[PDB]
Design a protein around this ligand. Structure first.
Ligand SMILES: COc1cc(C2CN(C(=O)c3cc(COC[C@@H](O)CO)ccn3)C2)ccc1OCc1ccc(C2CC2)cc1
Ligand SMILES: [Mg+2]
Ligand SMILES: [Mg+2]
Length: 301
């Protein structure tokens, strides 16, 4: 992710101690996710926030394999979450522990986990009787609308996400979707969705051609990625470009205008908005506000 002012150096942002929470008032539980150098662990926080709440939270932290560069990355994430401010459809910051030990970033806990796994498990549950309630089209529209609203919020704050994907969306109480980024708490090195391109491990099947070829990241490239996310939703969590190897031919195909076919559960106008997100000319793609407008109408019927 990057925020525009040229981009802002997140290392230079301020940490405001309004967020500080005593680490001794966390009681940790199970690990929710881990990468090479970082992890997210559930905890109970005692006396968190204005209301001195006692609640289940998620805590992002470094593993013993981390060094100073990963400390700095986690601090950058903390500062950017504080800078962007709060929204219903993002993963919100609740606190941090920066004094007296390793940096802990306390966020909302989202009881249904990531959207991709949720859709995959739900599909299996829905096939189970032949082989709570089932998903309906309206649910898929609500998830889509919710992520779009989170993205419109981020875009309104000059934030470019750069890893929009169902795997970075969580579902909380009421199955409300929230966009975030697992970041260091994701094991990208062993994840088939991140491909070696140069020095970096990149989610190439989600990426706009201008991001792949010219390393340009804009809000318009996030819209491309959102189109791919829509395809994930309306396929109930198929892998994009299924069965296709990422090589120079895939790279050329997408630059030449190849698009995935309509997923099984997309109405025609949802497939059309996917296609619109995949316009080769970035300025021809919809904005997140246009997507929100459209999806709010579709979801409220
Ligand atoms: C996904 O992103 C984040 C996640 C987090 C953590 C991970 N959490 C969870 O709540 C959670 C819950 C479950 C439960 O699963 C139970 C099921 O398996 C049972 O069926 C599984 C995995 N994770 C929040 C923090 C910051 C996160 O991102 C912070 C962030 C927010 C905005 C930005 C913008 C782009 C700059 C960057 C980073
Ligand atoms: Mg009180
Ligand atoms: Mg208090």
């Amino acid at each position: 992710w990057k925020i525009i002012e040229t981009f802002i150096d997140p290392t230079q942002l301020p940490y405001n101690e309004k967020w500080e929470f005593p680490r001794n008032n966390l009681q940790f539980g199970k690990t929710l996710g881990a990468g090479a150098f970082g992890k997210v662990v559930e905890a109970t926080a005692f006396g968190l926030g204005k209301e001195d709440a006692v609640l289940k939270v998620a805590v992002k932290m470094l593993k013993s394999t981390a060094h100073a560069d990963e400390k700095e990355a986690l601090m950058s994430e903390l500062k950017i979450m504080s800078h962007l401010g709060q929204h219903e459809n993002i993963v919100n910051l609740l606190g941090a522990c920066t004094h007296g030990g390793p940096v802990l970033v306390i966020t909302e806990y989202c009881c249904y986990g990531d959207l991709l796994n949720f859709l995959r498990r739900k599909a299996e549950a829905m096939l189970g009787p032949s082989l709570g309630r089932p998903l309906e089209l309206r649910d898929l529209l609500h998830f889509s609308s919710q992520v779009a609203q989170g993205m419109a919020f981020l875009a309104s704050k000059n934030c470019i996400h750069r890893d929009v994907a169902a795997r970075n969306v969580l579902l909380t109480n009421g199955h409300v979707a929230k966009i975030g980024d697992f970041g260091l708490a994701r094991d990208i090195m062993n994840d088939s969705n991140y491909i070696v391109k140069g020095n970096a491990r990149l989610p190439v099947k989600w990426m706009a051609p201008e991001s792949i070829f010219d390393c340009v990241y804009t809000v318009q490239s996030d819209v491309w990625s959102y189109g791919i996310l829509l395809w994930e939703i309306f396929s109930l969590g198929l892998n994009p470009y299924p069965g296709i190897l990422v090589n120079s031919k895939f790279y050329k195909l997408v630059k030449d205008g190849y698009q995935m076919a309509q997923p099984a559960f997309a109405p025609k106008n949802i497939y059309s908005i996917m296609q619109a997100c995949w316009a080769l000319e970035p300025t021809h793609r919809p904005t997140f506000q246009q997507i929100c407008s459209f999806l709010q109408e579709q979801a409220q019927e």
